Amino acid sequence: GICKSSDCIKSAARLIQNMDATTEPCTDFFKYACGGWLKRNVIPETSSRYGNFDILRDELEVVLKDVLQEPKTEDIVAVQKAKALYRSCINESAIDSRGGEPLLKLLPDIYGWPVATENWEQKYGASWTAEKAIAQLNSKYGKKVLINLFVGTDDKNSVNHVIHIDQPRLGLPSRDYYECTGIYKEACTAYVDFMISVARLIRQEERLPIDENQLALEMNKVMELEKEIANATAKPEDRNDPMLLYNKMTLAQIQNNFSLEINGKPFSWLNFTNEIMSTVNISITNEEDVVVYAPEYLTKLKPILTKYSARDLQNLMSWRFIMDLVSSLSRTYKESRNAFRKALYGTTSETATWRRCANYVNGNMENAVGRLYVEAAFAGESKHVVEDLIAQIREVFIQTLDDLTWMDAETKKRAEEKALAIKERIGYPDDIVSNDNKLNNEYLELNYKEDEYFENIIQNLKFSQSKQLKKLREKVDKDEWISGAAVVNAFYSSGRNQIVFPAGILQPPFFSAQQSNSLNYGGIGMVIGHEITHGFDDNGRNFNKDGDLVDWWTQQSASNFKEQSQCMVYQYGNFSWDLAGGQHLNGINTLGENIADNGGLGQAYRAYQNYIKKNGEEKLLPGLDLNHKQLFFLNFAQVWCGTYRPEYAVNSIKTDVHSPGNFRIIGTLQNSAEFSEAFHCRKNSYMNPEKKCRVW
Ligand SMILES: *[C@@H]1O[C@H](CO)[C@@H](O[C@@H]2O[C@H](CO)[C@@H](O)[C@H](O)[C@H]2NC(C)=O)[C@H](O)[C@H]1NC(C)=O
Ligand SMILES: C[C@H](C[C@@H](Cc1ccc(-c2ccccc2)cc1)NC(=O)CCC(=O)O)C(=O)O
Ligand SMILES: *[C@@H]1O[C@H](CO)[C@@H](O)[C@H](O)[C@H]1NC(C)=O
Ligand SMILES: *[C@@H]1O[C@H](CO)[C@@H](O)[C@H](O)[C@H]1NC(C)=O
Ligand SMILES: *[C@@H]1O[C@H](CO)[C@@H](O)[C@H](O)[C@H]1NC(C)=O
Ligand SMILES: [Zn+2]
């Protein structure tokens, strides 16, 4: 009763090679499941994290290189445009010959970079307003500095778009870095040195004189301004409640409540909104509804922005854009980022040009590249198998509801209604393959020059920003996919109450119609469970069946949810990560993902037990003396065989909403009585604590 097919041998070999059978499963299941992978692998110089999951993404890039690198006579225009974009990206000799010239030509259109400009005040100061400077970077280039103004889905009215106002992102990974001491010192030093190195290159190319102490002074001031901005931003812990974050107001109300004084000029919110909205010919009045996500930040900004000049502000705003463009210029510019990249990621070199380029074209032409990907790598017939697995997991979730003692009957019924209403999206939208003309029309406005990579990326920025802004007066497209197909991930959209499983994730170790079902349920079954559970986590549960931010919970049901979920906050908050210098995980910021992981594991294992009931035991895998209940957990854990560079661990512990792979494995299995029974774990062994956190 042993499976001896080619497919079973490959599954068995992989499972055998990754594990360390000398480790006791109940002492450390991560080391038992992944110890062999850990002993055999070294993190590549270009990777900040490496493991089975990242390897899948590296392998998908290989497919993208194969389908983009060679022209074919049959190629439709949309495909021709993707391949021409790819060719401009990989031509490093044309890029190197242009030096920094494409940036120099762009600099006047953003009101220049004072430090790299002679007589800046004379040249731009006359026509400089914060309203115009912030809006220019936003509307034309998608660069959001000081004030993040965007068009997006209305949380309380999923069918429409609204303008949002939020705090902007920082140059460094999180606000924590701006402390600039201990584990953050190297990154702060590399960041300012990076500003200076770029200012020095620009000044050298423009043939301007260079005073080293003045470069140091000016860029240290950019850092002091940004440290004040960072300290004014709300921590992620204070942005986890979508009810508290949502503050709908009119432009009139914003002008009263959140006034600002910049360079001795009173900030006009109406002027700023119109400076952006005019780009796609939309006029705005004080009657326009605006969602303010950061009212506290706008309040703290008022005393900060009065202390700095037009010069100091433009030095930061322009740097925040330049930072991102330096990698698209000649080797000299690319080199200037080396220490900064090493401090944030630990990587000693940049990823292969073709990989960055395949990823860049995938990101900007997700439908054209998605089409090329699915034709080369995806079954399509497998879409139906995943459709069934989704139905089995959705059913289990609905069944689990009645077995929840902490939720009342009314909240159980409403949760069932939302669970029933979840729309699924599997593999790819059929249209990208079957409707060549719709695909050609999507990229109509794009015209790439094969020798002008920088101009192509600039065109992409304007196109992306114009497309998002013109959505304001439009209804949200129901058919629209929230992700391209050539993606190794899955998603949940709270606004559409939809789960998305791109072709990229529908492959081993997650899914194969040719691998054991114990592996399918432990892999993609668990991923399906994770995405459904996102509709019911600390964020998703605040959204209804139609995707609206509305409370469908009774006070006692909500209170009991918070109590059950507080266990996971403490459980994961107590994990200490050696690679991150002994720092604790943020149990609050990782809560949504930990609820989803714990919820998903339960639903997939129960759906797999239901499968064994209906179809009986599966044939055993050779060379593995484990049953299929054990193989389910083994596959589940092997998704996360991998490790992190310590620089990247410091980064991700602050920026990632997911717990690191090892803790997702340890954490979920510690809470699983089902795991402990499969591996016969003694009570209070590391993998089997007495207290187990449960929510779904
Ligand atoms: C680590 O786990 C402990 C135990 O669950 C957590 O301790 C609780 O902390 C809160 C807030 O300080 C107290 O009100 C509780 O009384 C504590 N409970 C116990 C049993 O001591 C602790 O918060 C967790 N640490 C992190 C960083 O999450
Ligand atoms: C958008 C994101 C998608 C999610 C898909 C997923 C969900 C759970 C598991 C998994 C399997 C076995 C054990 C535990 C968990 C694997 C994949 N991706 C990540 O979680 C990491 C991606 C990354 O690192 O970029 C989300 O929904 O959070
Ligand atoms: C790179 O661009 C230069 C200048 O246009 C051109 O001479 C060269 O052929 C290009 N290389 C490739 C491989 O396309
Ligand atoms: C950070 O912000 C708070 C609140 O606005 C302020 O009181 C404090 O002085 C700031 N700290 C630093 C280091 O800038
Ligand atoms: C914004 O204000 C400036 C003067 O402060 C003005 O020249 C410009 O036309 C205004 N833009 C819009 C769209 O109102
Ligand atoms: Zn998730």
PDB file of C-alpha atoms in Angstrom, residues 260-448:
ATOM      1  CA  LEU A 260      -0.876  74.179   8.451  1.00  0.00           C
ATOM      2  CA  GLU A 261       1.590  77.111   7.975  1.00  0.00           C
ATOM      3  CA  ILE A 262       4.408  76.288   5.521  1.00  0.00           C
ATOM      4  CA  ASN A 263       7.234  78.778   4.589  1.00  0.00           C
ATOM      5  CA  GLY A 264       4.992  81.533   6.093  1.00  0.00           C
ATOM      6  CA  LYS A 265       2.060  80.636   3.757  1.00  0.00           C
ATOM      7  CA  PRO A 266      -1.294  79.247   5.108  1.00  0.00           C
ATOM      8  CA  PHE A 267      -1.762  75.780   3.544  1.00  0.00           C
ATOM      9  CA  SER A 268      -4.806  75.502   1.286  1.00  0.00           C
ATOM     10  CA  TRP A 269      -6.203  71.934   1.324  1.00  0.00           C
ATOM     11  CA  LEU A 270      -8.611  72.891  -1.510  1.00  0.00           C
ATOM     12  CA  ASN A 271      -5.705  74.215  -3.713  1.00  0.00           C
ATOM     13  CA  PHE A 272      -3.616  71.068  -2.955  1.00  0.00           C
ATOM     14  CA  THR A 273      -6.562  68.703  -3.772  1.00  0.00           C
ATOM     15  CA  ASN A 274      -7.180  70.577  -7.086  1.00  0.00           C
ATOM     16  CA  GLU A 275      -3.430  70.701  -7.979  1.00  0.00           C
ATOM     17  CA  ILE A 276      -3.585  66.856  -7.905  1.00  0.00           C
ATOM     18  CA  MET A 277      -7.179  66.297  -9.266  1.00  0.00           C
ATOM     19  CA  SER A 278      -6.657  68.698 -12.253  1.00  0.00           C
ATOM     20  CA  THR A 279      -4.110  66.159 -13.688  1.00  0.00           C
ATOM     21  CA  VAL A 280      -7.152  64.058 -14.820  1.00  0.00           C
ATOM     22  CA  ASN A 281      -9.525  67.108 -15.283  1.00  0.00           C
ATOM     23  CA  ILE A 282     -11.639  66.919 -12.063  1.00  0.00           C
ATOM     24  CA  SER A 283     -12.484  70.121 -10.115  1.00  0.00           C
ATOM     25  CA  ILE A 284     -12.998  69.907  -6.311  1.00  0.00           C
ATOM     26  CA  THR A 285     -15.027  72.115  -3.855  1.00  0.00           C
ATOM     27  CA  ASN A 286     -15.187  72.317  -0.018  1.00  0.00           C
ATOM     28  CA  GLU A 287     -18.252  69.963  -0.336  1.00  0.00           C
ATOM     29  CA  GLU A 288     -15.996  67.000  -1.355  1.00  0.00           C
ATOM     30  CA  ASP A 289     -15.997  64.167   1.178  1.00  0.00           C
ATOM     31  CA  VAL A 290     -12.474  63.083   2.269  1.00  0.00           C
ATOM     32  CA  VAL A 291     -11.424  60.117   4.475  1.00  0.00           C
ATOM     33  CA  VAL A 292      -8.780  61.281   6.942  1.00  0.00           C
ATOM     34  CA  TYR A 293      -6.743  58.278   8.221  1.00  0.00           C
ATOM     35  CA  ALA A 294      -4.188  60.449  10.034  1.00  0.00           C
ATOM     36  CA  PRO A 295      -5.871  63.393  11.925  1.00  0.00           C
ATOM     37  CA  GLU A 296      -3.364  63.149  14.860  1.00  0.00           C
ATOM     38  CA  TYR A 297      -0.407  63.286  12.397  1.00  0.00           C
ATOM     39  CA  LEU A 298      -1.746  66.389  10.552  1.00  0.00           C
ATOM     40  CA  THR A 299      -2.099  68.080  14.019  1.00  0.00           C
ATOM     41  CA  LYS A 300       1.509  67.212  15.057  1.00  0.00           C
ATOM     42  CA  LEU A 301       2.765  68.338  11.575  1.00  0.00           C
ATOM     43  CA  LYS A 302       1.528  71.986  12.115  1.00  0.00           C
ATOM     44  CA  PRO A 303       4.339  72.950  14.649  1.00  0.00           C
ATOM     45  CA  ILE A 304       7.008  70.914  12.760  1.00  0.00           C
ATOM     46  CA  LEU A 305       6.507  72.497   9.247  1.00  0.00           C
ATOM     47  CA  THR A 306       6.619  76.140  10.587  1.00  0.00           C
ATOM     48  CA  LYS A 307      10.311  75.495  11.662  1.00  0.00           C
ATOM     49  CA  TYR A 308      11.634  74.654   8.163  1.00  0.00           C
ATOM     50  CA  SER A 309      12.193  76.662   5.007  1.00  0.00           C
ATOM     51  CA  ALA A 310      11.137  75.899   1.368  1.00  0.00           C
ATOM     52  CA  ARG A 311      14.770  74.823   0.870  1.00  0.00           C
ATOM     53  CA  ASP A 312      14.849  72.322   3.786  1.00  0.00           C
ATOM     54  CA  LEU A 313      11.498  70.818   2.736  1.00  0.00           C
ATOM     55  CA  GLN A 314      12.383  70.496  -0.997  1.00  0.00           C
ATOM     56  CA  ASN A 315      15.709  68.892   0.039  1.00  0.00           C
ATOM     57  CA  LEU A 316      13.683  66.075   1.731  1.00  0.00           C
ATOM     58  CA  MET A 317      10.835  65.828  -0.862  1.00  0.00           C
ATOM     59  CA  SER A 318      13.208  65.593  -3.819  1.00  0.00           C
ATOM     60  CA  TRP A 319      15.534  63.137  -1.986  1.00  0.00           C
ATOM     61  CA  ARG A 320      12.532  60.816  -1.267  1.00  0.00           C
ATOM     62  CA  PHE A 321      11.953  60.605  -5.049  1.00  0.00           C
ATOM     63  CA  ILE A 322      15.690  60.517  -6.133  1.00  0.00           C
ATOM     64  CA  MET A 323      16.249  57.623  -3.624  1.00  0.00           C
ATOM     65  CA  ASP A 324      13.975  55.421  -5.816  1.00  0.00           C
ATOM     66  CA  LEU A 325      15.402  56.493  -9.221  1.00  0.00           C
ATOM     67  CA  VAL A 326      19.115  56.002  -8.533  1.00  0.00           C
ATOM     68  CA  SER A 327      18.765  52.208  -9.335  1.00  0.00           C
ATOM     69  CA  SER A 328      17.459  53.121 -12.864  1.00  0.00           C
ATOM     70  CA  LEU A 329      20.541  55.239 -13.741  1.00  0.00           C
ATOM     71  CA  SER A 330      24.204  54.336 -14.587  1.00  0.00           C
ATOM     72  CA  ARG A 331      26.408  51.967 -12.500  1.00  0.00           C
ATOM     73  CA  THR A 332      27.919  55.000 -10.594  1.00  0.00           C
ATOM     74  CA  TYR A 333      24.472  55.958  -9.298  1.00  0.00           C
ATOM     75  CA  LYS A 334      23.521  52.276  -8.657  1.00  0.00           C
ATOM     76  CA  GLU A 335      26.719  51.864  -6.493  1.00  0.00           C
ATOM     77  CA  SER A 336      25.775  54.848  -4.226  1.00  0.00           C
ATOM     78  CA  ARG A 337      22.947  52.735  -2.673  1.00  0.00           C
ATOM     79  CA  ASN A 338      25.228  49.772  -1.734  1.00  0.00           C
ATOM     80  CA  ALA A 339      25.719  50.462   2.057  1.00  0.00           C
ATOM     81  CA  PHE A 340      22.091  51.571   2.465  1.00  0.00           C
ATOM     82  CA  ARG A 341      20.824  48.301   0.847  1.00  0.00           C
ATOM     83  CA  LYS A 342      23.235  46.263   3.029  1.00  0.00           C
ATOM     84  CA  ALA A 343      22.029  48.043   6.233  1.00  0.00           C
ATOM     85  CA  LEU A 344      18.323  47.450   5.449  1.00  0.00           C
ATOM     86  CA  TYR A 345      18.513  44.001   3.754  1.00  0.00           C
ATOM     87  CA  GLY A 346      22.000  42.601   4.477  1.00  0.00           C
ATOM     88  CA  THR A 347      22.530  41.845   0.785  1.00  0.00           C
ATOM     89  CA  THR A 348      26.051  42.382  -0.676  1.00  0.00           C
ATOM     90  CA  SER A 349      24.811  42.908  -4.198  1.00  0.00           C
ATOM     91  CA  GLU A 350      21.650  43.712  -6.164  1.00  0.00           C
ATOM     92  CA  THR A 351      19.593  40.889  -7.636  1.00  0.00           C
ATOM     93  CA  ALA A 352      20.331  39.953 -11.320  1.00  0.00           C
ATOM     94  CA  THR A 353      19.223  42.713 -13.749  1.00  0.00           C
ATOM     95  CA  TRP A 354      16.976  40.290 -15.705  1.00  0.00           C
ATOM     96  CA  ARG A 355      15.165  39.361 -12.387  1.00  0.00           C
ATOM     97  CA  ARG A 356      14.577  42.985 -11.378  1.00  0.00           C
ATOM     98  CA  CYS A 357      13.408  43.636 -14.970  1.00  0.00           C
ATOM     99  CA  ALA A 358      11.074  40.595 -15.224  1.00  0.00           C
ATOM    100  CA  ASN A 359       9.583  41.739 -11.839  1.00  0.00           C
ATOM    101  CA  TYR A 360       9.330  45.370 -12.952  1.00  0.00           C
ATOM    102  CA  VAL A 361       7.453  44.435 -16.208  1.00  0.00           C
ATOM    103  CA  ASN A 362       5.215  42.004 -14.243  1.00  0.00           C
ATOM    104  CA  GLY A 363       4.349  44.823 -11.811  1.00  0.00           C
ATOM    105  CA  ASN A 364       3.440  47.363 -14.505  1.00  0.00           C
ATOM    106  CA  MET A 365       1.786  44.995 -17.077  1.00  0.00           C
ATOM    107  CA  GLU A 366       0.316  42.343 -14.803  1.00  0.00           C
ATOM    108  CA  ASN A 367      -2.270  41.240 -17.413  1.00  0.00           C
ATOM    109  CA  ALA A 368       0.158  40.892 -20.396  1.00  0.00           C
ATOM    110  CA  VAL A 369       2.797  39.100 -18.237  1.00  0.00           C
ATOM    111  CA  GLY A 370       0.041  37.081 -16.536  1.00  0.00           C
ATOM    112  CA  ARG A 371      -1.055  35.804 -19.980  1.00  0.00           C
ATOM    113  CA  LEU A 372       2.528  34.805 -20.922  1.00  0.00           C
ATOM    114  CA  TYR A 373       3.045  33.140 -17.568  1.00  0.00           C
ATOM    115  CA  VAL A 374      -0.184  30.990 -17.574  1.00  0.00           C
ATOM    116  CA  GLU A 375       0.448  29.765 -21.151  1.00  0.00           C
ATOM    117  CA  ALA A 376       3.912  28.584 -20.188  1.00  0.00           C
ATOM    118  CA  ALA A 377       3.449  27.310 -16.626  1.00  0.00           C
ATOM    119  CA  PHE A 378      -0.183  26.825 -15.537  1.00  0.00           C
ATOM    120  CA  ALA A 379      -2.439  23.806 -16.051  1.00  0.00           C
ATOM    121  CA  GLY A 380      -5.772  25.657 -16.011  1.00  0.00           C
ATOM    122  CA  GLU A 381      -7.527  22.312 -15.679  1.00  0.00           C
ATOM    123  CA  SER A 382      -6.304  22.475 -12.062  1.00  0.00           C
ATOM    124  CA  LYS A 383      -8.582  25.576 -11.529  1.00  0.00           C
ATOM    125  CA  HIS A 384     -11.544  23.197 -10.970  1.00  0.00           C
ATOM    126  CA  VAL A 385      -9.670  21.093  -8.312  1.00  0.00           C
ATOM    127  CA  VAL A 386      -8.851  24.287  -6.288  1.00  0.00           C
ATOM    128  CA  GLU A 387     -12.553  25.439  -6.743  1.00  0.00           C
ATOM    129  CA  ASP A 388     -13.641  22.183  -4.943  1.00  0.00           C
ATOM    130  CA  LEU A 389     -10.995  22.626  -2.171  1.00  0.00           C
ATOM    131  CA  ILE A 390     -12.268  26.191  -1.626  1.00  0.00           C
ATOM    132  CA  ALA A 391     -15.895  24.834  -1.283  1.00  0.00           C
ATOM    133  CA  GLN A 392     -14.704  22.204   1.235  1.00  0.00           C
ATOM    134  CA  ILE A 393     -12.833  24.853   3.315  1.00  0.00           C
ATOM    135  CA  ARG A 394     -15.650  27.462   3.161  1.00  0.00           C
ATOM    136  CA  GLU A 395     -18.044  24.676   4.363  1.00  0.00           C
ATOM    137  CA  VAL A 396     -15.759  23.757   7.278  1.00  0.00           C
ATOM    138  CA  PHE A 397     -15.544  27.423   8.312  1.00  0.00           C
ATOM    139  CA  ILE A 398     -19.402  27.718   8.297  1.00  0.00           C
ATOM    140  CA  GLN A 399     -19.676  24.407  10.335  1.00  0.00           C
ATOM    141  CA  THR A 400     -17.043  25.669  12.902  1.00  0.00           C
ATOM    142  CA  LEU A 401     -19.293  28.695  13.642  1.00  0.00           C
ATOM    143  CA  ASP A 402     -21.909  26.622  15.520  1.00  0.00           C
ATOM    144  CA  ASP A 403     -19.188  25.025  17.660  1.00  0.00           C
ATOM    145  CA  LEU A 404     -18.117  28.519  18.969  1.00  0.00           C
ATOM    146  CA  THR A 405     -19.379  29.073  22.526  1.00  0.00           C
ATOM    147  CA  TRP A 406     -18.105  32.672  22.795  1.00  0.00           C
ATOM    148  CA  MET A 407     -20.292  34.054  19.931  1.00  0.00           C
ATOM    149  CA  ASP A 408     -24.063  34.579  20.155  1.00  0.00           C
ATOM    150  CA  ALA A 409     -26.668  33.162  17.669  1.00  0.00           C
ATOM    151  CA  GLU A 410     -27.260  36.458  15.855  1.00  0.00           C
ATOM    152  CA  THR A 411     -23.493  37.128  15.320  1.00  0.00           C
ATOM    153  CA  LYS A 412     -23.142  33.422  14.213  1.00  0.00           C
ATOM    154  CA  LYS A 413     -25.833  33.940  11.540  1.00  0.00           C
ATOM    155  CA  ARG A 414     -24.242  37.193  10.212  1.00  0.00           C
ATOM    156  CA  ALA A 415     -20.751  35.530  10.090  1.00  0.00           C
ATOM    157  CA  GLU A 416     -22.311  32.654   8.064  1.00  0.00           C
ATOM    158  CA  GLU A 417     -23.881  35.226   5.639  1.00  0.00           C
ATOM    159  CA  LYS A 418     -20.485  36.860   5.055  1.00  0.00           C
ATOM    160  CA  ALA A 419     -18.732  33.438   4.701  1.00  0.00           C
ATOM    161  CA  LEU A 420     -21.372  32.389   2.105  1.00  0.00           C
ATOM    162  CA  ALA A 421     -20.981  35.651   0.133  1.00  0.00           C
ATOM    163  CA  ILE A 422     -17.135  35.339  -0.329  1.00  0.00           C
ATOM    164  CA  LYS A 423     -16.286  35.442  -4.050  1.00  0.00           C
ATOM    165  CA  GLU A 424     -13.309  33.290  -5.168  1.00  0.00           C
ATOM    166  CA  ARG A 425     -10.805  34.059  -8.021  1.00  0.00           C
ATOM    167  CA  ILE A 426      -8.649  31.148  -9.161  1.00  0.00           C
ATOM    168  CA  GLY A 427      -5.545  31.076 -11.417  1.00  0.00           C
ATOM    169  CA  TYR A 428      -6.129  33.925 -13.877  1.00  0.00           C
ATOM    170  CA  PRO A 429      -8.958  36.008 -15.476  1.00  0.00           C
ATOM    171  CA  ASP A 430      -9.978  34.012 -18.587  1.00  0.00           C
ATOM    172  CA  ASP A 431     -10.046  37.331 -20.641  1.00  0.00           C
ATOM    173  CA  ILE A 432      -6.220  37.846 -20.559  1.00  0.00           C
ATOM    174  CA  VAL A 433      -5.888  34.676 -22.661  1.00  0.00           C
ATOM    175  CA  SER A 434      -9.199  34.729 -24.663  1.00  0.00           C
ATOM    176  CA  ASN A 435      -9.528  38.509 -25.402  1.00  0.00           C
ATOM    177  CA  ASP A 436      -6.377  39.827 -27.147  1.00  0.00           C
ATOM    178  CA  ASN A 437      -8.020  43.113 -28.081  1.00  0.00           C
ATOM    179  CA  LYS A 438      -9.228  44.027 -24.547  1.00  0.00           C
ATOM    180  CA  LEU A 439      -5.590  43.358 -23.461  1.00  0.00           C
ATOM    181  CA  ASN A 440      -4.145  45.510 -26.322  1.00  0.00           C
ATOM    182  CA  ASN A 441      -6.611  48.315 -25.431  1.00  0.00           C
ATOM    183  CA  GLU A 442      -5.504  48.220 -21.768  1.00  0.00           C
ATOM    184  CA  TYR A 443      -2.009  49.389 -22.763  1.00  0.00           C
ATOM    185  CA  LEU A 444      -3.089  51.736 -25.644  1.00  0.00           C
ATOM    186  CA  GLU A 445      -1.545  54.894 -24.050  1.00  0.00           C
ATOM    187  CA  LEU A 446       1.874  53.187 -23.426  1.00  0.00           C
ATOM    188  CA  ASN A 447       4.636  53.730 -25.971  1.00  0.00           C
ATOM    189  CA  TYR A 448       8.054  52.530 -24.977  1.00  0.00           C
TER     190      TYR A 448
END
